[PDB]
Amino acid sequence: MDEFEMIKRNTSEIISEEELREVLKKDEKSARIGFEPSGKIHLGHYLQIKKMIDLQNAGFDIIIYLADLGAYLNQKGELDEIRKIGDYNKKVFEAMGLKAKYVYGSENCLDKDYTLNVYRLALKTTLKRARRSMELIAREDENPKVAEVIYPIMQVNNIHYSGVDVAVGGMEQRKIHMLARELLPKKVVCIHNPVLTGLDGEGKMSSSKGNFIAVDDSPEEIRAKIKKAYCPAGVVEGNPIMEIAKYFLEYPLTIKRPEKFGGDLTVNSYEELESLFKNKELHPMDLKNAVAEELIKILEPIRKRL
Amino acid sequence: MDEFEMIKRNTSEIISEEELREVLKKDEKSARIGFEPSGKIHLGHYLQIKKMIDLQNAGFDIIIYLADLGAYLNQKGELDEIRKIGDYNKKVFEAMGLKAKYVYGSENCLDKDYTLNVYRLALKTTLKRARRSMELIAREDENPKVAEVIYPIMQVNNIHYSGVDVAVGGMEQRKIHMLARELLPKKVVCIHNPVLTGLDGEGKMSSSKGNFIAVDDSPEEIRAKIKKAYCPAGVVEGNPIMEIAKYFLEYPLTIKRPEKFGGDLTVNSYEELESLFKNKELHPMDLKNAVAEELIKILEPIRKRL
Ligand SMILES: N[C@@H](Cc1cc(F)c(O)c(F)c1)C(=O)O
Ligand SMILES: N[C@@H](Cc1cc(F)c(O)c(F)c1)C(=O)O
Question: Which of A181, A235, B31, B38 has the most CB atoms around its CB within 10 Å?
């Protein structure tokens, strides 16, 4: 493989690839991702963390930003409560096997120079640019608040003050990151990960919704959720089960089936699993049973360490 | 004339009158007005300052806030440049015969608690409410910035941290002040002054529209500006000359005219001057000559002290 290829693996985009290669030449390099503290930690978080681990193995210093102020501005609750949730998320990230630097937003000093730079960034960012960047991030509100447009300019300001070389996040974070690449003196290389489809096949997998597989879910809960999940035969696009098998399952994979239904099946890659599912040679239920058991094995050490 | 009446004199509105009377009972009371630093100090500023003087005589502790940060957010230029202009405005305010405490926006540090309260104010203020409050204040821009909606919540936060009892400003500040009266624990009494019409009879009198009469303008410049000013016969509304005579001129007033045009005329109140002008008994030219010479007398000590 390669350090570049390992990092690029299972990503939606890299901004840009040539900039990434120029960063890999450095001996000291840092990558930073920020999370709004979530009550439950699902696969959507795990995918990001796994990518941060890939960067860690490449020689990057990993920084995990617990955006408690961001969640506060995004109408998620009270500061100290979000702080508590952030602490729980840190322990979960540790249980995933990621040893990194965990920084809260509660500190942040918020000195004169920080707020001054916020004003300077707010002076160069239009309201329409700021709102568009918050479309996939801002909590649904009939009446958008002023805090909604303070959110993205702070995330840009945080990228600047961290001085990191690489910024990581979901595809929902791209518009903010591109805005950060335009205003800031030092252009950060953005690595955006795919957005996981919810179990019901409607909308993204979020903690605020009821379509997630938490990393600490019981094996019975995992089996039930996967079983009830949206998974039409032949359709790969928008299929969460196919997504989980693509981003989490380890290959070569053996699918257990009764002899009456074709017997056990062994695939060597996701592409083979994808082809077998496209031509409907594999039934969704057998796919679900395979993915469920493998997901249980994978999430088990994390479940045990909590 | 009561202290209440003396304060209410030549105001547009007071929010509210009963709240004002409850403040007048206190031995220690404060009134605060904020100005975006302007290159030239015009009659609009003088009207505000005169009202601050009325409050000073009423027993109020006067605070002038030089909003250099506000102007910075409103796209007026660079901080240090705005600060310089702010200093010049302080000297002009002193020359007006107003001794008070002058506070800059850049000196008042942006500690964690300040920015934190800004976040909470932004969390309770909609984008639509914030923009509507900036309609008569914000610099004209085809592409409104995020800084535009940080402006009004800061002005609200400033009223809170100052702890003043009475807030003073033009009618353009009312939507911000009423927003401040809604969100803040302590409800401040708002005294709003009328908006002076420009010399061309179009739009408000501003330093950026060139329809103003600076307090340090030369007598020849004042005579010229008054002479070319919009002043149709019979029309009192939207007439800058009538406005100047109403808010600045001292009565009883004697209007000097040649015997061929009716000879010298002596009015005792603005109401009589208004009635004489409505019935076209007084020609606009004679009004202009009267207003000009009196304004020159009034502004003379100010110009000399500069
Ligand atoms: N926008 C991120 C949270 C976040 C991450 C950051 F790196 C960040 O700097 C920030 F202010 C907020 C999210 O959607 O969770
Ligand atoms: N709104 C004022 C400037 C100003 C006054 C204040 F009192 C104030 O607190 C502020 F932040 C800005 C103006 O338009 O001049």
Answer: B31
